[PDB]
């Protein structure tokens, strides 16, 4: 519990250790052809400190739920990093010399095939975020005595998302996470916009409510001073560093960003930098107190069925909050996180069942992202977070690279469509479906009424991957019996008959005025069948297709989106090419405008009459 | 023009001036059944101020490029916005009572189909940014006389966009950009985090490098002294307000963000707050100094064809670079932005030969989307922003509401899809199709080789709406002669015969995929059609088809993105339906990994060698 003050021998063991970790950034960039060994090189002993003085984790176990997390938030100083982990003997040093082979996992820059990263990084910005996540959790959720250390570079800070993190850390008084600042002067292109103006580093940091050193970066002695106290505020450890530190004629100088050494100066260089290490001899690292609980990873169900009833109107946003309290009373995994929105995506209504497991995040979706995805690391917790979906768009970047992290989280999306009406496009989710379909990873879920809505949040829970809910403001009819079977992937024929003329696909507020156009054209004898997809992707291809032959091929898609990306396009790129099938697409032409809902459906062409007119044409 | 110091009586029309605009904004949102009355309420004295005392602007010219520019960054209080436009003269009153309507332009939020609004709002936290552009704008190019006012929530600077637009003012020195921070301690759904802690809303500005001056927001007088002060820096007034001021029995309290007052109890809290009014009087505007230049709007032609050779080899984003150069010398509005990464996109050759036009904006990609959006304002100047195509999905909000102001800027994209290589997936655009092909005002450019991305360029340049061009690392050859026309819409044919068995469709690295792939089956006495699309969106539906019809109705797409909302998508949806036409697809499946270019697109399927086996695959299934 003690800090261990370091004599003299640890001190240049711990500058040794500095030294190889910058002789091995060189060799592997120099190996590869690419790379940033002047990244590196400024974190050397900071990477040195944390790694052998400071931080407390099994070496041979990475992921270790009781080790202390380190986060690479500048991930282009992947080489660095892995260059640690050889030096604490989880990997062969060997290895690193196939940096960024297509032969060897020790890529561009660290990703969770990695055991020793939980987060990729490489869009900078994110990775204090991801480490808010981990530490919100250590602290609240796990209650366990791990630290969490970010590592993030000067340019990176002009990223307005770590400002998110710096205020969540304040906020939430993580007082077990500790960020460090590789201050050393220079971006890509250019010194980055401070410079070396320490204080007003320190001052920006202090006024965000962090407790802020100032250290001479290249110090072994004063890192360890530093990282050796803890505070009961987030710390941050501003660190004056040189960009290509120990790189003599490199060492501070501009145009040599992401640049490797090429093979004749790298050998002369490491020549100069190994004349510099006192001994071979390696230091040991030291394992964490085993105080993380025990985590079970088996599938949560809802307690009961859904006790909706067929004929009552709900909106599919509030079947979302009240499902997701549902879900959280049978597993205390189950957490919500928020953008200061709870009140209209309903959320609110776990944050009042469940108020320890409800994360405010306020008007800060990158981070809200970010946060989420620290917690799923591990399998620690089960994130469901929830904004407007329009305003997913602002952490598209997050979720992104939640894909490539290989992340467990679930995003509800609400106020999607026209349908919302009177705030107007600024809050219209028109887009999501392209955005969420192009996540790789990725489920989509379009719930059509309040018992569908519950069955995906239940599915979503149990899928891996990115699972995005597509949520909505109209109150809607319930359609489906609370004991209709769902899943991923399979859609539902809602309205059939024999002699159907045309297959229509809606979702959401366009399920409704497709059955509702069904009824208008009854009375002129033309049948249509109607299908709800229930999922956008995967989409359930075989009941499409299978609906389409029972209606003279004739697919037509409506939808509350944009043309692209979305539904029709979909259903299009599933069937093109399939003898006797022809695709109709309605959807949103253009940004929309303020009006009543039923209006703005009319106005873009994707209500009930709309729906009509259109199977007419068609049937003509 | 030095600081008028207002009488008491000026004082009182103000304190007057606010409270109409208190009952205008309960009449309108009573009227409509939503809106935001309380936020609109918290601004009133700051509202008046600015408009009846601070700002100089035509009142029947609201767009007229000599005013100072207001940015409601809150857009939420629209219905304030609009009840000064009517005060002003501009709008009529009755007007304001159709807030929210079908038949009306007085929409939820504001847009530009507003005289008086630049850009739409409604997407906190980007109302700072547009205006920081305005300011760069008003005092680097303009060099006008033109003042830029912002006011932004308090819940609002949670987002980080607002902080990378604080520390772009300071960078820049922009003396001519006021924020007005509305710190009325509540959000939508619980209080703001800081709340009324005025002191630490000053430590952080002033640790961002701004002039921090903390006023009671609802005191016409300090509002209109700390605004008649100029400043070296950029100045933010944090103004402590109440929420909902002035409406008994709601001020300051929770529950009611985006809540209209019911018609009864509007017409109560309306009489009290007419009680407070001395004079139905109104103040006038007072017009600006116009020294703001003359702006050319012609079309824009690049000084010359372009200098390549068929068969040269250049990578696109280079060539983007050389483009961007050339055309500033055709057209003193063209500017160029970038986010730390001018040496990777090319932009540093514009810096070099244009560095008065090239704005530096640091590792900020949602600021920069912000800035070009608002130098684009009143038509002012072309903006080209560039970074890694990857890293405009840390913008998409900003681009998204940039369709929504209507704005014409231009983004170009590097580094796309796998061919990148060994810095792997974190730094490969592979959704960037699917994202701008969802901006409903998007172009989106494809260019293959040099020539057409200086050709994809200069269209840009002439093209309204958001422009994007998707540049490549690899080093591909010329393949157009330097006069080879381009259009948008319009895709080209570069290998054909008549017996040709597919069409393949490629683009950039995969569109020389598939010539190497002919050449290959070339061998075989298998002869394919290769189309370069040159426009993704809008797509040359008519050549698709008439190709697909010279070849057996076969199309084949490749292309280095996901599966999803990308080029093969876009020609399934333009082609389902149409009798005989067949489509298969090559992309990306999945979250890619590091190693050399060459063995990426072959690990990913979208290679020479994957097009070669698709293509016989096609063939033998027949
Ligand atoms: C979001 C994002 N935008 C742009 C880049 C491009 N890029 C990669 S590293 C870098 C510069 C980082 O500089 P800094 O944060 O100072 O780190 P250093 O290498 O100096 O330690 C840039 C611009 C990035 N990877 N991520
Ligand atoms: C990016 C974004 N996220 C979420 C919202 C949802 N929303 C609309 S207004 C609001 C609260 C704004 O509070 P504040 O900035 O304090 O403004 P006030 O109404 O108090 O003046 C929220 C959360 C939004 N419009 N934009
Ligand atoms: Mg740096
Ligand atoms: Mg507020
Ligand atoms: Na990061
Ligand atoms: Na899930």
């Given at each position: ?503 229509v696909?809606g979702?959401?507020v366009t399920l409704h005025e497709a059955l509702a156009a069904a009824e208008l054209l009854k ?5 249509i069948?109607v ?27 409506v ?27 309605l ?11 039923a209006?703005?459906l009319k106005?873009?062409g994707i209500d009930r009459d709309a729906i009509a007119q259109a199977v ?5």
């Amino acid at each position: 519990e003690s800090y261990h003050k370091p004599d003299q021998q640890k001190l240049q063991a711990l500058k040794d250790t500095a030294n190889r970790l910058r002789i091995s950034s060189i060799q592997a960039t120099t190996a590869a052809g690419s790379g940033h060994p002047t990244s590196c090189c400024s974190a050397a002993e900071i990477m040195a400190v944390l790694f052998f003085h400071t931080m407390r984790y099994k070496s041979q176990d990475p992921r270790n739920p009781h080790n202390d997390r380190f986060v690479l938030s500048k991930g282009h100083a992947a080489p660095i990093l892995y260059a640690v982990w050889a030096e604490a003997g989880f990997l062969a040093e060997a290895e690193l010399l196939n940096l960024r082979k297509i032969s060897s996992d020790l890529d561009g820059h660290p990703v969770p095939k990695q055991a020793f990263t939980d987060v990729a990084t490489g869009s900078l910005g994110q990775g204090l975020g991801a480490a808010c996540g981990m530490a919100y959790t250590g602290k609240y959720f796990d209650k366990a005595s791990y630290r969490v250390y970010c590592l993030l570079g000067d340019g990176e800070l002009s990223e307005g998302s770590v400002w998110e993190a710096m205020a969540f850390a304040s906020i939430y008084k993580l007082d077990n996470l500790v960020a460090i600042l590789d201050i050393n002067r220079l971006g890509q292109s250019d010194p980055a916009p401070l410079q070396h103006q320490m204080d007003i580093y320190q001052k920006r940091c202090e006024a965000f409510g962090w407790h802020a050193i100032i250290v001479d970066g290249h110090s072994v002695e004063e890192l360890c001073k530093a990282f050796g106290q803890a505070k009961h505020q987030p710390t941050a450890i501003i660190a004056k560093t040189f960009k290509g530190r120990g790189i003599t004629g490199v060492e501070d100088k501009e145009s040599w960003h992401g640049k490797p050494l090429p093979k004749n100066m790298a050998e002369q260089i490491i020549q100069e930098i190994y004349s510099q290490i006192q001994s071979k001899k390696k230091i040991l690292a030291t394992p964490p107190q085993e105080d993380a609980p025990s985590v079970d990873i088996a599938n949560i169900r809802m307690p009961s069925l859904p006790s909706y009833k067929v004929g009552d109107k709900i909106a599919t946003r509030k079947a979302y909050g009240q499902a997701l309290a549902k879900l959280g009373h049978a597993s205390d995994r189950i957490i919500a996180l928020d953008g200061d929105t709870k009140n209209s995506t309903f959320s609110e209504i776990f944050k009042k069942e469940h108020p320890d497991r409800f994360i405010e995040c306020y008007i800060a979706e990158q981070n809200m992202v970010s946060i989420a995805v620290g917690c799923a690391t591990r399998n620690r917790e089960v994130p469901f977070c929830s904004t407007f979906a329009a305003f997913f768009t602002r952490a598209f970047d997050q979720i992104r690279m939640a894909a490539i992290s290989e992340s467990n989280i679930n995003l509800c999306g609400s106020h999607c469509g026209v349908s919302i009406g009177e705030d107007g496009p600024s809050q219209m989710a028109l887009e999501d479906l392209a955005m969420f379909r192009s996540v790789p990873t990725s489920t989509v879920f379009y719930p059509s009424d309040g018992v569908a809505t519950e069955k995906a949040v239940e599915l979503a829970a149990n899928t891996k991957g990115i699972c995005f809910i597509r949520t909505s403001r109209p109150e809607n009819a319930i359609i489906y019996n609370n004991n209709e079977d769902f899943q991923v992937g399979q859609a539902k024929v809602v309205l059939k008959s024999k002699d159907d003329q045309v297959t229509v696909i809606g979702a959401g507020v366009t399920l409704h005025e497709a059955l509702a156009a069904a009824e208008l054209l009854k009375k002129e004898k033309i049948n249509i069948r109607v299908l709800d997809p229930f999922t956008i992707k995967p989409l359930d291809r075989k009941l499409i297709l299978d609906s389409a032959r029972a209606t003279k091929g004739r697919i037509l898609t409506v939808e509350d989106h944009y043309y692209e990306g979305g539904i029709g396009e979909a259903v299009s790129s599933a069937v093109v090419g399939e003898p006797g099938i022809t695709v109709t697409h309605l959807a949103v032409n253009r940004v929309p405008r303020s009006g009543k809902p039923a209006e703005l459906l009319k106005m873009f062409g994707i209500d009930r009459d709309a729906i009509a007119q259109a199977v007419r044409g068609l049937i003509t």
